[PDB]
Design an enzyme around this catalytic site. Sequence first.
Site, PDB file in Angstrom:
ATOM      1  N   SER B 113     -29.469  45.861 -20.251  1.00 49.99           N
ATOM      2  CA  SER B 113     -30.205  45.336 -19.107  1.00 49.99           C
ATOM      3  C   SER B 113     -29.592  45.910 -17.841  1.00 49.99           C
ATOM      4  O   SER B 113     -28.422  45.648 -17.543  1.00 49.99           O
ATOM      5  CB  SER B 113     -30.171  43.808 -19.075  1.00 49.99           C
ATOM      6  OG  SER B 113     -30.749  43.314 -17.881  1.00 49.99           O
ATOM      7  N   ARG B 114     -30.378  46.684 -17.097  1.00 47.66           N
ATOM      8  CA  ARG B 114     -29.878  47.352 -15.904  1.00 47.66           C
ATOM      9  C   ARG B 114     -29.791  46.434 -14.694  1.00 47.66           C
ATOM     10  O   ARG B 114     -29.200  46.827 -13.683  1.00 47.66           O
ATOM     11  CB  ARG B 114     -30.761  48.554 -15.573  1.00 47.66           C
ATOM     12  CG  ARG B 114     -30.019  49.700 -14.921  1.00 47.66           C
ATOM     13  CD  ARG B 114     -30.911  50.920 -14.770  1.00 47.66           C
ATOM     14  NE  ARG B 114     -31.398  51.405 -16.055  1.00 47.66           N
ATOM     15  CZ  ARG B 114     -31.102  52.593 -16.566  1.00 47.66           C
ATOM     16  NH1 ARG B 114     -30.313  53.442 -15.928  1.00 47.66           N
ATOM     17  NH2 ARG B 114     -31.611  52.936 -17.745  1.00 47.66           N
ATOM     18  N   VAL B 115     -30.360  45.232 -14.763  1.00 48.54           N
ATOM     19  CA  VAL B 115     -30.316  44.296 -13.647  1.00 48.54           C
ATOM     20  C   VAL B 115     -29.527  43.078 -14.113  1.00 48.54           C
ATOM     21  O   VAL B 115     -29.779  41.945 -13.688  1.00 48.54           O
ATOM     22  CB  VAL B 115     -31.737  43.927 -13.172  1.00 48.54           C
ATOM     23  CG1 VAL B 115     -31.704  43.179 -11.843  1.00 48.54           C
ATOM     24  CG2 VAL B 115     -32.596  45.172 -13.059  1.00 48.54           C
TER      25      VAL B 115
END
Lengths: 56, 126, 478, 470, 352
Positions: B113-115
Amino acid sequence: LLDAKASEHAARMTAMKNATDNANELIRTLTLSYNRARQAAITQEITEIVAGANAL
Amino acid sequence: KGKHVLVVYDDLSKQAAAYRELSLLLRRPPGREAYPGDIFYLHSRLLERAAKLSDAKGGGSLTALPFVETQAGDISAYIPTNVISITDGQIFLQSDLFFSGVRPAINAGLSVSRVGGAAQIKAMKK
Amino acid sequence: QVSDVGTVIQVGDGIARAHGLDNVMSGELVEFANGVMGMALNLEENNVGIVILGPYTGIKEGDEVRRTGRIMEVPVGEALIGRVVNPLGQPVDGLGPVETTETRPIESPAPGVMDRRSVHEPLQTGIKAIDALVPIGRGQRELIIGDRQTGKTSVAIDTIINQKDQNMISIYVAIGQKESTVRTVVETLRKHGALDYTIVVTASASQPAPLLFLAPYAGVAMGEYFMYKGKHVLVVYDDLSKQAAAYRELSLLLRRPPGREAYPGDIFYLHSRLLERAAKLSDAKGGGSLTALPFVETQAGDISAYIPTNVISITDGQIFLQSDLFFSGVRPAINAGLSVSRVGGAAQIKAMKKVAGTLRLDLAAYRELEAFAQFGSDLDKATQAKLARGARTVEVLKQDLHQPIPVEKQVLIIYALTRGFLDDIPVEDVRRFEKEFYLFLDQNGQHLLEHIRTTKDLPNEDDLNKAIEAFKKTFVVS
Amino acid sequence: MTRGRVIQVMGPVVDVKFENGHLPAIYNALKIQHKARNENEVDIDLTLEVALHLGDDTVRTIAMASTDGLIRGMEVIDTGAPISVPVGEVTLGRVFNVLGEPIDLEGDIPADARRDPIHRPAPKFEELATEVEILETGIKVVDLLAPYIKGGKIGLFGGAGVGKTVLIQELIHNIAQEHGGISVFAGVGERTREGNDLYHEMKDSGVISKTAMVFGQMNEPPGARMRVALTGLTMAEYFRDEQGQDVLLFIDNIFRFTQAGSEVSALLGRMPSAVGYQPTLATEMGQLQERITSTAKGSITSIQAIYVPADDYTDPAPATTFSHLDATTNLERKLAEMGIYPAVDPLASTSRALAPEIVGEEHYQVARKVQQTLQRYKELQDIIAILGMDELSDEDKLVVHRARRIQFFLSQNFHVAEQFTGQPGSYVPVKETVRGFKEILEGKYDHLPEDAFRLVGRIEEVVEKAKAMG
Amino acid sequence: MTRGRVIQVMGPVVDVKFENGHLPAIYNALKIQHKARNENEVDIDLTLEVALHLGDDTVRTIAMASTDGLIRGMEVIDTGAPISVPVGEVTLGRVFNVLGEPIDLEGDIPADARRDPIHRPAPKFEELATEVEILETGIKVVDLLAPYIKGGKIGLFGGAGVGKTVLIQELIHNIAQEHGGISVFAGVGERTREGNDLYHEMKDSGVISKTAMVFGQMNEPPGARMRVALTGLTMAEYFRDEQGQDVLLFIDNIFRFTQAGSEVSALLGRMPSAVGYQPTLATEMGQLQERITSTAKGSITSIQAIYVPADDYTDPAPATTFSHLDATTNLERKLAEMGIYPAVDPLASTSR
């Protein structure tokens, strides 16, 4: 104990030799699969290129 | 209008295949795997509309959950790579783990998950 | 400018294109001014696409093309037996012309569902291994698949020779073979006397691709006439792989889109249309039969290849030849796991049926007793007897070249092996034992041979055992 | 006058030119009846199907048979409607070709018989069923581990000679017996010998009196090899929509349908696809499969045999086909040789409906426990040989015993097998088989011989067989 | 008539337009001989081979040399027959290119000498010998383990520095001494320095007195690189037929022949075959090999060196070539480093 040491050394002899033979037998089949994959890749690429050139 | 919207695309691979069929019927020149050249642009247009609007625009939002179906777990295929290169992260599901009754069959190592962090409450984050 | 007679426009790589021929029909034969035949595939809006069935060197733009009024046909008749002809039916060996009076279309419909009937008549190939483990019916499509130089042509020649007195017409179709090899094959067939009931159809490698493509259809068309007249026909295709290569060449020349391995998508239809014509007709249709033995040449034993998979999907069963044991001089080992005859089993006569099961079990046990079980000296169980009997079976299954064995002698020797009468005689003397046993049988067990030949069943065990024991007493071990 | 002439012939593709303003619509049927005018012509009776409008009042069509003997300028007439196939009870116990003409020797069909079009739009969203309805097939293994669903597509796998035909016949007979529903068999592109053998097997088993047959075996042209599946489907649709009864549909090989489509697209002239297939692969397959659904007045469920080219499971045709299936049943030669004759693999059989929501929580628990026990037995099978029967715990011995009992109980005696074994066979309800497997898992029958479980129906049959044994 | 004019030049591919009704047949030889009319042109001496009839009285040809300096409208003269190469005793001890012109400094061949067409139909079914015969070479290894069949094709394997040239020379010498038959060498796609070294080696050893040599360099166009093998074969056919004596035919590398065929097919524009080769690969190889047979009054046997691309024995070119081989002889660097000659492997070698 000495006889057991000699026996374990001979057993390691046989086990390592069998491992090497199995590795070579795997190598030959892997090379065959590699050649088949190479031919398939070449034929697909050339077919796509000629189709794209022929579309015009 | 300031609302919050969630959109789920049940399969983008089917849409890509349909676009390929349409382009081929239109007699456009094909590219890799007979796909048209703008196959990447087709998904970039759609996915780039999902955004979190600023405070001046009204504070609305629109999150998306596109789906991609692999073939025997081949994550390196053309469409999966194109979609992965566009979205923020990805969640991978494993057939072997699904068969053993583990529902959902989330693969924690592959899923990213990049966020991460900013999307969690304080308790869950800690 | 009457335009019912064509004029050539484009010539190249064996494919022509002619203007005119308004009344020509699709699939007709067209003759050039040179005297070379040709077949018309495409009827475009203005011109006609013609495939040249011969040397195109003499064909130039502006030549005259004449209709013949006949769909693709080949001459068929009794006079064709013993001759060597190209796919168009023209003689190649000389010896004057062929005086036939009938023709059949190349493209003909296969027998329908209601026309066929389940097969029950054996086809005695004369090879011990095949006749014991993998039987062949008289309406069966059995594939013989293996790598290069594995004696496939030798197997075919032995099978053809074995039909000497079985009143069965044989057809040998050589696709892509070397002309010298075909000539030697014809020579050995003549020497053994098979020319009285066989037809040879040849299409060498130097011939243009259309002839290679057409040869199997011409062979099966020649077979169909005898099949519908009520007789039994055997047809052998030498290389469907080479035929498929020729068809791929033609399709690529005609600018068609290729598929997997550059083959056109029509290759499966090409093979199915040919192999679907072999069937066992019902008594209502006449009771005739035509069986096919196609050959496929593989590379490194790759069953996964496109053409081998397609041919396997069509035929009833396949016989696999291994190049591993061909170097020993033995006729290449029939891979027990990969060889199967689903249609067969019902074809085998009672005598061989009562023993094939135990022979198969013994061979399977010996084969599963691999080299790992041959190591050490601790194998004191019945595994030693299993190994001895398996060595006996493998030694017995060996066979010489062009020496078909009658089914009676095959049954007798296999029964002798399975009933333990050879468990004591050493391995190295087994072949001499078999030969002297055949001589002893032909000298004394004529009543047993006649009984088997008449009732298709074994004689009394208590009598055959005494016969074997008498022969063993007469015999001497080296 | 709606009368046209041939301008182009090339392979199975024929181009026709019509008078302006009278072009036949797509999928219409064209007839070519010709009588030879001399010795340089051949009589032709051929049927064509419209495919494209090429412009300039020219229509490109595909042939339903061989195009040999066609001559440019031949007269072509149109039927004004797509291919029509007779429907109703007259099709039962009969064999049809792609055009719907009877192939068998039982005579032809009267002209007044109702005929329906081949091509039809899929049922609308409103008419479909709102919830999953499990179909009780009466076979223990199928009804327990990989249940079938009304309106669902089932993929059938396994080679030849492993019980495929026996399973098909048993399914047809059981459905006709317990649901009153007929079956339809479509021989799409397979061996004529196999087709004849299956026809004779069904005829002498007596099942043919409640089924229809359409054959499109390998030697037929691509047009027939495509439309045979559609004519079988339109035969089944009548019974679904009029009699309001469940119907079984069998497709002998669905891969031949897509292969024929690929063959004909190149002739049509469309640009190829990833592996040379037609660009319309997904939409064509979807148009075929979407008609096999469940409505408020019955359902059609289909058992489809699948083939893979060059054993490549990532090939586009199997990849597209697999997205429509709902369950998979695998047939194992090892089980066939061991002799248990449902011939179906209990571990490789999967179903979308094997969830506690659909089949019930108790059924789900029973299935999961049986699967776990069989998996444990399969894992033990290694040490069973390497270490022998020795060094096994009491739990291992007990689970081997229970797994042997379960494996022997999974077998069943079929009504079809009566003609060769004498015993009649039985129909096992899902509740009864769940109860029996619950009892076996609880250990209530750990004292009975394992051979008393072979070829029996309900649990009482095991007890009676054990009493007969001793 | 006899005159045609160039209308299209595209790399090594030249198209010629004749007057209607007089187009030359396929595989004919077209000659272009031009002299510079002024200072804006250059002299041209070129030979073309007819390949296709494109319609509209145009013909598509492939060039046997460089096409630089060509001008649209230049006159082209037709010979009425395919390429013709001198045959007979005069070819012994000489070196020729693909066109039959001598290469060495020995002097040109008189124009009245007999010449024969390159392309020729293979011998018919009747002419072939009925039984197999063994060609005695006089070498123990070959005569014992891998016998040579008269009219057969033999594959030769091995890298440089292991004895290939010595084996070739000894085979030629033994055959000439004990059978009276000459040999012909055809260096398809050779390296020029290696060819020169081999020529000097044969000249020193004295073998060259009874052999004919044909060279196709790697700097030659694909048409020449493809037709060199055929011109060598048609040189050998004269001695097979007229003199009625057994002949050896050596091909330096047949894989380069196949590669040149694929290149020329690509130039012509045919759709590619399995792995990019020409679709006509099998029939081209057949038309080459099927002329190396044994007839009633003679025979031609061939020793061919084979290179395996990427060491793949399932590659289409080796697969097609292997279907014609009758025997195989392998050279071994282990036997070379040991004190044994001709260093032929006794186990890898095989023979039908």
